[PDB]
C-alpha cells in the first residue's frame, strides 16, 4: 500500500485498501473509512466494480437525464466519489469549511455552501436526486465568482469548478461534445 493519504498526500493514521494499493485518512476517505469490514475496499474499487459488472453504464448520458436520478446506492457512490476527487485538489482548501463575507463594494451571497456542508449532507441522505447534490455543488463555486468580483482570487473558483465539471462528466458517462 501507499504511506500517503490519496486525498491530502499526508502521512498519518492510514487505512488501507484490500484490493488497491491506496490508503487513507479516516475522514479523508469518503464515507468514512468503515469500522470492521476484513477485506476493506476503498470507493475507488467500489466505483470500478459498478463500471465492470455493467460496461454499458460507461456509454454516453445527456445530463438532464443524469441530473434527475434518484440517489439510489450506486448514485449516492457516485456523487460521494465526486466530492472526493474535489477535495483531492489541494486547492479545495478554500472551499471547505463555513466562509464569511466582509469585503468593501461586495455583498455575501443570500446561500452560502461549502464543501464539508455537502458532506454532511450526503452522510445525512439529505439529497433524494443528483440535481440536489450537483446543485449545491456548483452553487459554491458562483458565490465564490460573485462575491470576489474582480479580486484574480476569483480564480481559485474556476479552478476547482473545473476539477468538479471534469470529474462529473467521467463519473456520470456524460456524452462527449464540443
Ligand atoms: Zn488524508
Ligand atoms: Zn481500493
Ligand atoms: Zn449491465
Known amino acids: 500500500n501507499s504511506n500517503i493519504c490519496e486525498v491530502c498526500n499526508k502521512w498519518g493514521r492510514l487505512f488501507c485498501c484490500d484490493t488497491?494499493?491506496?490508503?487513507?485518512?479516516?475522514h479523508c476517505h469518503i464515507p468514512s473509512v468503515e469500522a470492521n469490514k476484513n477485506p476493506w475496499s476503498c470507493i475507488f474499487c467500489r466505483i470500478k466494480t459498478i463500471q465492470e459488472r455493467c460496461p454499458e453504464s460507461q456509454s454516453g448520458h445527456q445530463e438532464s437525464e443524469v441530473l434527475m436520478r434518484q440517489m439510489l446506492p450506486e448514485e449516492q457512490l457516485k456523487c460521494e466519489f465526486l466530492l472526493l476527487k474535489v477535495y483531492?485538489?489541494?486547492?479545495?482548501?478554500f472551499f471547505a469549511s463555513e466562509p464569511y463575507y466582509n469585503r468593501e463594494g461586495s455583498q455575501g451571497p443570500q446561500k452560502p455552501m461549502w464543501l464539508n456542508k455537502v458532506k454532511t449532507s450526503l452522510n445525512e441522505q439529505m439529497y433524494t436526486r443528483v440535481e440536489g447534490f450537483v446543485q449545491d455543488m456548483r452553487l459554491i463555486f458562483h458565490n465564490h465568482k460573485e462575491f470576489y468580483r474582480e479580486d484574480k482570487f476569483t480564480r481559485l473558483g474556476i479552478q476547482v469548478q473545473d476539477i468538479f465539471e471534469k470529474n462529473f462528466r467521467n463519473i456520470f458517462a456524460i456524452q462527449e461534445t464540443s
Do not use: G, I, T, Y
Open 20 to 26: 488497491c494499493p491506496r490508503s487513507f485518512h479516516e
Open 88 to 93: 483531492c485538489d489541494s486547492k479545495s482548501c
